[PDB]
Amino acid sequence: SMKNVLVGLGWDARSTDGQDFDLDASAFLLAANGKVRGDADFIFYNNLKSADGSVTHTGDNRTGEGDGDDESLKIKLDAVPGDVDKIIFVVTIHDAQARRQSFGQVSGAFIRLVNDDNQTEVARYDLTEDASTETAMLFGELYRHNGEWKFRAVGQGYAGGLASVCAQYGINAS
C-alpha cells in the first residue's frame, strides 16, 4: 500500500588524518520470473534517477557527515511499470572493504525506512549487529501482492561481492 518509499542510511564518520568510512546505497531490480530482466538495470551514481522506474537517488555521501540519513533513495511504487515485479535495496562498504573495514569498523551505522506518503518511520536495522557478520548487507526486499506493494525484511550478508550480488540476482546459487 506504500504509495511512496524513502530509504535513509546514516552513520558517524571518523576523520583520523584523511581516511573515513563511506557506505554506498544501491537498488537492484528483480522480475517475478525469478530473474531480473537485467541486473545492470540497478540505480547507482551513474544514474541520477530512473527514467521510467520513477526511482531517484538522493546522493552518495563520501564520509557520512550529516546528523541525519546520510544517503537515501526515493521510490514512488505508484509509478513502477508492470515490467518489474520485485525490487531490493542494499548497502555495501566502498573500497574500505579491501583495507578490511566492514561497517563494524564504524562507530555504529544505521539504516532507516519511511513511507514519504504517510510520513511514518517503518523500521531501521543496526549495522553494529549485522556488521561483525560481513562487509556488505541487504536491508530488505519489496514485491507486489494482490496488486498491492509490500515490503519484507530478510537480513542477508554477502562476504563482499558488490559485482556479484548485482548479477547474482539474475541467477540463483547452488
Task: Give the interface with Ca ion as residue ranges (CB under 5 A).
Answer: 10, 22, 24, 60-61, 64, 66, 70
The residue with cell 551513474 is 46
Closest distance to Ca ion from the beta carbon of 11 (Å)? 5
Residue 9 or 87 having the CB closest to Ca ion? 9
DSSP per-residue letters across 131-160: STT-S-EEEEEEEEETTEEEEEEEEE--SS
Is residue 21 within 8 Å of residue 64, measured between CB atoms?
yes
Residue 39 or 70 having the CB closest to Ca ion? 70
Residue 42 or 151 having the CB closest to Ca ion? 42
- How far is 141 from 123, CA to CA, in rounded Å? 13
Three cell numbers written together for 25: 546505497
Residue 110 or 151 having the CB closest to Ca ion? 110
DSSP conformational letter for 106: S
Closest distance to Ca ion from the beta carbon of 82 (Å)? 32
Closest distance to Ca ion from the beta carbon of 60 (Å)? 4
Strand partners of residue 5: 75
Residue 80 or 136 having the CB closest to Ca ion? 136
Closest distance to Ca ion from the beta carbon of 164 (Å)? 20
Q: What is the CA radius of gyration of the chain?
A: 16
- How far is 93 from 14, CA to CA, in rounded Å? 15
Residue type, 129: E
Closest distance to Ca ion from the beta carbon of 129 (Å)? 18
- How far is 116 from 95, CA to CA, in rounded Å? 31
